[PDB]
Design an enzyme around this catalytic site. Structure first.
Site, PDB file in Angstrom:
ATOM      1  N   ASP A   1     -37.251   6.617   9.445  1.00 31.15           N
ATOM      2  CA  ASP A   1     -37.370   8.084   9.341  1.00 31.15           C
ATOM      3  C   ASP A   1     -36.264   8.902  10.190  1.00 31.15           C
ATOM      4  O   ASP A   1     -36.444  10.109  10.232  1.00 31.15           O
ATOM      5  CB  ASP A   1     -38.647   8.419   9.593  1.00 31.15           C
ATOM      6  CG  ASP A   1     -39.576   8.329   8.316  1.00 31.15           C
ATOM      7  OD1 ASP A   1     -39.229   7.273   7.359  1.00 31.15           O
ATOM      8  OD2 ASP A   1     -40.866   8.863   7.994  1.00 31.15           O
TER       9      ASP A   1
ATOM     10  N   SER B   1     -47.034  11.497   3.310  1.00 34.73           N
ATOM     11  CA  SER B   1     -46.269  12.441   3.990  1.00 34.73           C
ATOM     12  C   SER B   1     -45.249  12.840   3.406  1.00 34.73           C
ATOM     13  O   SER B   1     -44.090  12.655   3.664  1.00 34.73           O
ATOM     14  CB  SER B   1     -45.805  11.975   5.558  1.00 34.73           C
ATOM     15  OG  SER B   1     -46.892  11.658   6.324  1.00 34.73           O
TER      16      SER B   1
ATOM     17  N   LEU C   1     -33.489   9.181  -0.931  1.00 40.88           N
ATOM     18  CA  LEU C   1     -33.017   8.633   0.244  1.00 40.88           C
ATOM     19  C   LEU C   1     -33.039   6.994   0.077  1.00 40.88           C
ATOM     20  O   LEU C   1     -34.041   6.302  -0.131  1.00 40.88           O
ATOM     21  CB  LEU C   1     -33.903   9.071   1.589  1.00 40.88           C
ATOM     22  CG  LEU C   1     -34.259  10.529   1.871  1.00 40.88           C
ATOM     23  CD1 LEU C   1     -35.237  10.335   2.553  1.00 40.88           C
ATOM     24  CD2 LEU C   1     -32.883  11.026   2.508  1.00 40.88           C
TER      25      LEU C   1
ATOM     26  N   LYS D   1     -43.215   7.672  15.544  1.00 35.95           N
ATOM     27  CA  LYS D   1     -44.473   7.367  15.575  1.00 35.95           C
ATOM     28  C   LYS D   1     -44.841   5.953  14.847  1.00 35.95           C
ATOM     29  O   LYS D   1     -43.852   5.293  14.474  1.00 35.95           O
ATOM     30  CB  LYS D   1     -45.527   8.508  14.927  1.00 35.95           C
ATOM     31  CG  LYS D   1     -44.813   8.907  13.728  1.00 35.95           C
ATOM     32  CD  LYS D   1     -45.493  10.181  13.377  1.00 35.95           C
ATOM     33  CE  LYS D   1     -45.054  10.698  12.179  1.00 35.95           C
ATOM     34  NZ  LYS D   1     -45.580  12.381  11.883  1.00 35.95           N
TER      35      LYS D   1
HETATM   36  C1  LIG Z   1     -45.552   1.520   2.700  1.00 36.03           C
HETATM   37  C2  LIG Z   1     -44.504   2.487   3.031  1.00 36.03           C
HETATM   38  C3  LIG Z   1     -44.507   3.316   4.432  1.00 36.03           C
HETATM   39  C4  LIG Z   1     -44.661   3.474   1.899  1.00 36.03           C
HETATM   40  N1  LIG Z   1     -43.049   2.125   3.017  1.00 36.03           N
HETATM   41  C5  LIG Z   1     -41.931   2.446   3.310  1.00 36.03           C
HETATM   42  O1  LIG Z   1     -41.622   3.707   3.186  1.00 36.03           O
HETATM   43  C6  LIG Z   1     -40.682   1.584   3.255  1.00 36.03           C
HETATM   44  C7  LIG Z   1     -40.544   0.506   2.715  1.00 36.03           C
HETATM   45  N2  LIG Z   1     -39.264  -0.100   2.740  1.00 36.03           N
HETATM   46  C8  LIG Z   1     -38.641   0.856   3.335  1.00 36.03           C
HETATM   47  N3  LIG Z   1     -39.381   1.979   3.675  1.00 36.03           N
HETATM   48  C9  LIG Z   1     -39.237   3.229   4.530  1.00 36.03           C
HETATM   49  C10 LIG Z   1     -38.450   4.372   3.510  1.00 36.03           C
HETATM   50  C11 LIG Z   1     -38.365   5.593   4.258  1.00 36.03           C
HETATM   51  N4  LIG Z   1     -37.482   5.361   5.549  1.00 36.03           N
HETATM   52  C12 LIG Z   1     -36.259   5.925   5.891  1.00 36.03           C
HETATM   53  C13 LIG Z   1     -36.147   7.074   5.140  1.00 36.03           C
HETATM   54  C14 LIG Z   1     -34.694   7.795   5.513  1.00 36.03           C
HETATM   55  C15 LIG Z   1     -34.173   7.439   6.687  1.00 36.03           C
HETATM   56  C16 LIG Z   1     -32.827   8.117   6.962  1.00 36.03           C
HETATM   57  N5  LIG Z   1     -32.034   7.442   7.783  1.00 36.03           N
HETATM   58  N6  LIG Z   1     -31.202   8.560   7.998  1.00 36.03           N
HETATM   59  C17 LIG Z   1     -31.449   9.608   7.129  1.00 36.03           C
HETATM   60  C18 LIG Z   1     -30.649  10.879   6.963  1.00 36.03           C
HETATM   61  F1  LIG Z   1     -29.767  11.079   7.307  1.00 36.03           F
HETATM   62  F2  LIG Z   1     -31.618  12.035   7.434  1.00 36.03           F
HETATM   63  F3  LIG Z   1     -30.679  10.990   5.443  1.00 36.03           F
HETATM   64  O2  LIG Z   1     -32.657   9.400   6.614  1.00 36.03           O
HETATM   65  C19 LIG Z   1     -34.557   6.388   7.397  1.00 36.03           C
HETATM   66  N7  LIG Z   1     -35.922   5.633   7.121  1.00 36.03           N
HETATM   67  C20 LIG Z   1     -38.006   4.267   6.618  1.00 36.03           C
HETATM   68  C21 LIG Z   1     -38.117   2.825   5.744  1.00 36.03           C
END
Ligand SMILES: CC(C)(C)NC(=O)c1cncn1C1CCN(c2ccc(-c3nnc(C(F)(F)F)o3)cn2)CC1
Length: 273
Positions: free
Chosen positions: A160, A23, A91, A143
């Site tokens: 996210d 995505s 990010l 989700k």
């Molecule tokens: C296997 C896979 C699915 C590819 N794994 C991970 O994506 C992954 C591994 N470790 C962590 N991750 C994830 C990495 C992406 N994620 C985020 C990103 C941004 C934000 C956010 N919070 N505030 C903001 C603001 F303000 F809009 F910028 O953005 C919160 N979560 C969720 C954890």
């Protein structure tokens, strides 16, 4: 072993170690040199935000980096970054190597009732935290593939946050990959907290059925037509436990004013300790 990227202030390092992609996103291992704690370095595909839009996002990022809750993925910082001909939004968040609920259901085929109860309660505590911020924060795109686990028997964290701003209903979407959808009223871009309740209902449905809701539709437009006419996903009738089914039913109502509040869900007999 080497650093392959850095924030301007040198706080965050990027490692050439891919955690996963999906995505409009690629996620790498990284390092907070300030604490030595490893982090996730997420690179976002670029749009063309008007600098009206780009200012709203930097404001939102500033709001969101100040938050801390045990069931919300910790967000540290964001900035723009180039390698060759590609620009992205980077990010930095805490690292969750155990992956998401989507991955859990794929691996373990079903989720047992005690797990479903505990993790759904945690999702609700996370949403209640967001909705009680001043002003309230609405996730808008909850989700199973953005809810993360700390371990196979750990806790869950909502990921996210803040990214839903970039992808409205007015925004045209290619028919590719799994079709997306949202609470009925969201399509018209006037809405509130209850859109996260509807999304929670769909999350609980997926956890209870190990299926993506509306799998029987091939595109987003088909799902819109059903959601906006109160036609439930086919999977709803596959929910085996009456009490789980009732909770889902009370969350996924077409009319937002009829949906459960987060409070009533947390106080529901199903969620009592
Ligand atoms: C296997 C896979 C699915 C590819 N794994 C991970 O994506 C992954 C591994 N470790 C962590 N991750 C994830 C990495 C992406 N994620 C985020 C990103 C941004 C934000 C956010 N919070 N505030 C903001 C603001 F303000 F809009 F910028 O953005 C919160 N979560 C969720 C954890």
């Amino acid at each position: 072993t080497k650093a392959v990227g850095m924030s301007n202030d040198g706080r965050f390092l990027k490692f050439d170690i891919e955690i996963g992609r999906g995505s409009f996103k690629t996620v790498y291992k990284g390092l907070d040199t300030e604490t030595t704690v490893e982090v996730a370095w997420c690179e976002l595909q670029d749009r063309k935000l008007t600098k009206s839009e780009r200012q709203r996002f930097k404001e939102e990022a500033e709001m969101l980096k100040g938050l801390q809750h045990p069931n919300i993925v910790r967000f540290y910082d964001s900035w723009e970054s180039t390698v060759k001909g590609k620009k992205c939004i980077v990010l930095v968040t805490e690292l969750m190597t155990s992956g998401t609920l989507k991955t859990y259901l794929k691996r373990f085929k079903v989720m047992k009732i005690k797990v479903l109860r505990s993790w759904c309660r945690q999702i609700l505590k996370g949403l209640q935290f967001l909705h009680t911020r001043t002003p309230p924060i609405i996730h808008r795109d909850l989700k199973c593939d953005n809810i993360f686990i700390t371990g196979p028997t750990g806790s869950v964290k909502i990921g996210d946050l803040g990214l839903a701003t970039l992808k409205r209903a007015s925004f045209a979407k290619a028919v590719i990959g799994t079709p997306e959808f949202m609470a009925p009223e969201m399509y018209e871009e006037k809405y509130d907290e209850s859109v996260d309740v509807y999304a929670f209902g769909m999350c609980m449905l997926e956890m209870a059925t190990s299926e993506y809701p509306y799998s029987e539709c091939q595109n987003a437009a088909q799902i819109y037509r059903r959601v906006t006419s109160g036609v439930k996903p086919a999977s709803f009738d596959k929910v085996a436990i009456p009490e789980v089914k009732e909770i889902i039913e009370g969350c996924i109502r077409q009319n937002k004013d009829e949906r459960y509040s987060i409070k009533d869900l947390l106080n529901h007999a199903f969620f009592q300790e």
